[PDB]
């Protein structure tokens, strides 16, 4: 008695794995060496981004199975292979328990290039949308009730760093702790800050001697809020201990970052030392030239640094912490090195959906 | 109560609204599906204009389906196909007043091509090949 009727243009989306473009806001005239790539793959942005807001939808966000961090991992490798060209690279090949590996020596020209990050967007073609979770107390996975449809995001500044989150996105209400599975002891716990921890970090007029001042009281109250938040998930009676590191490579046993093309390796031994129960710190940085690569397995040595004082002030906005599960108190040492987790903290609240505007429903029509 | 007229909720809006309310505003969504307007070596349109062509092609692909289940007076038409019980056997008071389109297609996504092939073949070979016999006299 009831007949099927077709409908074109119903608000229905599915989970896709499409490829987005960037569309950042470059100037196409400078030689900042981000803006060369930031014009090379990016069209200029729009002046009026749309912020259409939905009413009753509840959508399941996921963080650690997101298909945007691999798109991050492709184009940031493409950007770092053009912007900062090192002098000599050593990449093993190991052509085929019976195997031997040989290393090559690729040598290219290495001029001194300026390096300062530029905030970029990631925008989708027609037929797609990005759902965005507006909850100020988002756990990280599962349902979000205040889902808003977005053309494309805010500016993400691609700062390669370890042991911390530098120039990130600040939290709304409180300090958030995001983890796929607590009491698993094998996954990096990402922690966002609700306030920016300002730090000066400079090399003044031995060229490989840089000192790095961070305020004591602001860091103390920030980690007061942090250890307040870790007691939520651990029974409200455990002692919290912050160690420095546990061996490893120089880019993971120390806070490794970049500043004007200079490759900073600052020690954080006196920065994570307190034990918690129920004026300025200086960091002994050492500027190096023979570094390890995160894009692939290998070595890279670079030109000697330029002459003069170098300045870069920055805002500390997060943490990569890792538990030391034993057999009582809890030990939390800083870690990192996985860059997919480095840009998962700023792409945690986004999801790419594909629209399918063709539905069918039973109604009572004929001819 | 008093009124001033309807409103504009935006593109992809009212996805959490009811079925009969979201079926009222298909025109605004279908107009945005095509979008349009827009208005050194420096050739980035090799990417960008590419995307534009893709969008146009996508519309034609959907148009092809809506051209071949032949109504072409779009956003609403009807066919002569009765439903089958394996495709979410629900009644009208379940299906038209109390859920959105997301929860409908979330369960009809299992049965996409099995109804699309039947709507492809049945009326389009049965409403055809009979008016030629009716044109004999």
């Amino acid at each position, epitope marked *: 008695n009831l007949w099927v009727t077709v409908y074109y243009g119903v608000p229905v989306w599915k989970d896709a794995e499409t490829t987005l473009f960037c569309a950042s806001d470059a100037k196409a005239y400078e030689t900042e060496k981000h803006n060369v790539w930031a014009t090379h793959a990016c069209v200029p942005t729009d002046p*009026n981004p749309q*912020e*259409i*807001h939905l009413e009753n939808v509840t959508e399941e966000f996921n963080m650690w199975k997101n298909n945007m961090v691999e798109q991050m991992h492709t184009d940031i490798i493409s950007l770092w292979d053009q912007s900062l060209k090192p002098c000599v690279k050593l990449t093993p090949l190991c052509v085929t328990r019976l195997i031997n590996c040989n290393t090559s020596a690729i040598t290219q020209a290495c001029p001194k290039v300026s390096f300062e990050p530029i905030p970029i967007h990631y925008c989708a073609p027609a037929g797609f949308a990005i759902l965005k979770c*507006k909850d100020k107390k988002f756990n990280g996975t599962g349902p979000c009730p*205040s889902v808003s449809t977005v053309q494309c995001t805010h500016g993400i500044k691609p700062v390669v760093s370890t042991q911390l989150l530098l120039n990130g996105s600040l939290a709304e209400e409180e300090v958030m702790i995001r983890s796929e599975n607590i009491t698993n002891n094998a996954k990096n716990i990402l922690v966002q800050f609700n306030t920016p921890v300002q730090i000066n970090c400079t090399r003044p007029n031995d060229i490989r001697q840089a000192h790095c001042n961070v305020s004591k009281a602001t860091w103390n109250e920030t980690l007061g809020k942090v250890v307040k938040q870790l007691r939520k998930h651990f029974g409200n009676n455990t002692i919290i201990r912050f160690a420095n590191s546990s061996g490893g490579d120089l880019e993971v046993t120390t806070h490794s970052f970049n500043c004007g093309g200079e490759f900073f390796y600052c020690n954080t031994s006196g920065l994570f030392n307190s034990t918690w129960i129920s004026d300025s710190i200086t960091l002994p940085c050492r500027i190096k030239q023979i570094i390890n690569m995160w894009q692939r397995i290998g070595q890279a040595m670079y030109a000697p640094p330029i002459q003069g004082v170098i300045r870069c002030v920055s805002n500390i906005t997060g943490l990569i912490l890792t538990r030391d599960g034993g057999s009582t108190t809890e030990t939390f040492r800083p870690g990192g090195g996985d860059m997919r987790d480095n840009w998962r903290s700023e792409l945690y609240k986004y999801k790419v959906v594909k629209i399918e505007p063709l539905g069918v429903a039973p109604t009572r029509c004929k001819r | *109560a*008093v*009124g*001033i*007229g*309807a*409103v*504009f*909720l*935006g593109f992809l*809006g009212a996805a959490g609204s009811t079925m009969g309310a979201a079926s009222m505003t298909l025109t605004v969504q279908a107009r945005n599906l095509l979008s349009g307007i827009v208005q050194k070596l420096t050739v980035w349109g090799i990417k960008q204009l590419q995307a534009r062509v893709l969008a146009v092609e996508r519309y034609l692909r959907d148009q092809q389906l809506l051209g071949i289940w032949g109504c072409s007076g779009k956003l609403i038409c009807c066919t002569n196909v009765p439903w089958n019980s394996s495709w979410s056997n629900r009644n009208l008071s379940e299906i038209w007043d109390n859920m959105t389109w997301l929860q409908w297609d979330k369960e009809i996504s299992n049965y996409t091509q099995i109804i699309y092939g039947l709507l492809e073949e049945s009326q389009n070979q049965q409403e055809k090949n009979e008016q030629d016999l009716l044109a004999l006299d």
Partner: antibody
Amino acid sequence: QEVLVQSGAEVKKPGASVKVSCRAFGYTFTGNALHWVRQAPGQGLEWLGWINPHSGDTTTSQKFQGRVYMTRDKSINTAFLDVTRLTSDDTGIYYCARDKYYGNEAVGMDVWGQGTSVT
Amino acid sequence: DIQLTQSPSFLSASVGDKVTITCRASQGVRNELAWYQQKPGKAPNLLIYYASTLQSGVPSRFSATGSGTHFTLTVSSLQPEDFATYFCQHMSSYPLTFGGGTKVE
């Protein structure tokens, strides 16, 4: 998250005009109608008018017909209220309120701003 | 116009009491009245739309009944944050008028 932000307090002489702006955050401005309501100090609530932000259509009370004018701007999501020919009776707090607007008719005013004091 | 009379004008009660406040409309308004709460110095916030339905975020201790011209707001148990000024306002016809207001203490 859903919030209306008004402008600061303004003091004017009688016979002048006063303009107050109300900006929306947290929701789509073109989908909900907007009311204006005034409270005299020590008195009750007096309704003023209500506007569609989409079509620009207005509806004004007949007591203040031709004296208060209501406009909109969709580019910055702001509505403007113009009250002309002021007397001492018009001093009070001006509030912009988002209509809940179910079934394309007036239902209730759920999201209210912080207020503007006009003397 | 349509005039709304609220009774009583000033009510006195203790913490934990059940109270009922009556809004009377001069004309037939069906069920198109809404109930609001205002603290002094702050904006009014909505409790009841459609004269019987609870607004999301309002606690369940409040209720509202009525039809025609006779309308009641009922608080089952008074809390110290509930001591404020209550209003009724309609939308059946132009112009919109608010009630006189009921201050509870």
